[PDB]
Amino acid sequence: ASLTEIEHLVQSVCKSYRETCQLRLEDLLRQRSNIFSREEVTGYQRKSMWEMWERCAHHLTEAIQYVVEFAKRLSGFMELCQNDQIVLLKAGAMEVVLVRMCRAYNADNRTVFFEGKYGGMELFRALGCSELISSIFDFSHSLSALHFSEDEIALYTALVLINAHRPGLQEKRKVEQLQYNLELAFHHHLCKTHRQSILAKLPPKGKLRSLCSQHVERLQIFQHLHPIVVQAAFPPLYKELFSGGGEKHKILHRLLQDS
Numbered sequence: 001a002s003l004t005e006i007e008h009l010v011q012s013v014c015k016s017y018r019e020t021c022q023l024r025l026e027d028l029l030r031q032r033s034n035i036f037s038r039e040e041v042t043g044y045q046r047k048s049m050w051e052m053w054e055r056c057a058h059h060l061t062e063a064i065q066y067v068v069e070f071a072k073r074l075s076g077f078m079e080l081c082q083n084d085q086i087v088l089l090k091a092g093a094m095e096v097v098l099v100r101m102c103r104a105y106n107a108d109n110r111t112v113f114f115e116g117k118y119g120g121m122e123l124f125r126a127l128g129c130s131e132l133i134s135s136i137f138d139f140s141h142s143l144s145a146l147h148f149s150e151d152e153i154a155l156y157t158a159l160v161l162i163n164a165h166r167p168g169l170q171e172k173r174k175v176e177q178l179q180y181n182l183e184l185a186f187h188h189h190l191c192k193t194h195r196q197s198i199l200a201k202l203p204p205k206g207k208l209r210s211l212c213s214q215h216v217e218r219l220q221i222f223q224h225l226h227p228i229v230v231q232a233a234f235p236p237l238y239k240e241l242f243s244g245g246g247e248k249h250k251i252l253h254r255l256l257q258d259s
């Protein structure tokens with residue numbers, strides 16, 4: 001691959017991200033003064049654990065749906081076999097969501113945009129997973145200190161997804177080739193924009209892995225307490241990704257075959 005091709009991959013990735021970023025950055029920035037009042041915070045804290053879990057699962061499912069479309073438009077992704085497309089999304093869709101989330105996080109007051117306004121960690125106290133919430137806020141706080149541009153988020157989240165080390169890949173060498181090209185595009189862009197200083201400050205892969213593992217652990221705790229809530233009121237795509245034995249849902253298969 002030559003230089004003009006690396007730059008074409010840079011613009012192709014940024015275009016696929018812009019078309020699938022879910023929320024406009026300007027919309028998120030303009031709403032920073034719109035913060036939940038103490039009464040609205042109390043209202044969220046008074047909601048039942050199962051209602052807050054349901055609402056968060058819905059917002060999570062919607063964010064994952066945009067990540068799936070990002071993948072479908074990502075150069076090289078649809079060339080991979082369907083098994084590998086599903087392996088990469090099952091392991092990586094949530095990690096992409098957690099990175100994208102830093103756009104909706106305000107490090108000045110430690111709040112995140114949620115259901116129309118900004119609120120702190122205390123907004124989510126009814127979930128009963130305070131340790132995971134604090135880890136998510138800490139992760140978004142760490143990414144916010146980097147002051148990512150939109151192009152940087154695009155190239156970085158493409159690499160989060162195209163990981164040739166995910167277990168279960170059948171065409172590992174093909175994913176390796178795509179990952180190498182996307183790394184070149186990412187690094188070429190950082191070199192051109194004099195932003196290579198962020199490479200040492202990107203979080204280690206173990207941080208994203210720990211966040212996703214905590215998600216599975218806290219979901220199993222909740223599913224034990226409210227199994228009918230999960231079965232009847234959680235979205236099917238959410239259950240295919242995090243719950244078990246819920247992998248029986250074909251949702252990802254159908255989202256990839258549409259368009």
Ligand SMILES: CC(C)=CCN(C(=O)N(C)[C@H]1CC[C@H](c2ccncc2)CC1)c1cccc(NC(=O)c2ccccc2)c1
Nearest residue numbers: 021022023056057059060063097100101103104215218219
């Ligand atoms: C703090 C909190 C809970 C926030 C609620 N929530 C949420 O706001 N999401 C999905 C945002 C994800 C980012 C998305 C975005 C932002 C900016 N630009 C583009 C896209 C907006 C929606 C969220 C976010 C990350 C993870 C979770 N986790 C769960 O629901 C869960 C917890 C335990 C077990 C299983 C699942 C929930």
Ligand code: NA
Nearest residue numbers: 102103105144
């Ligand atoms: Na931010």
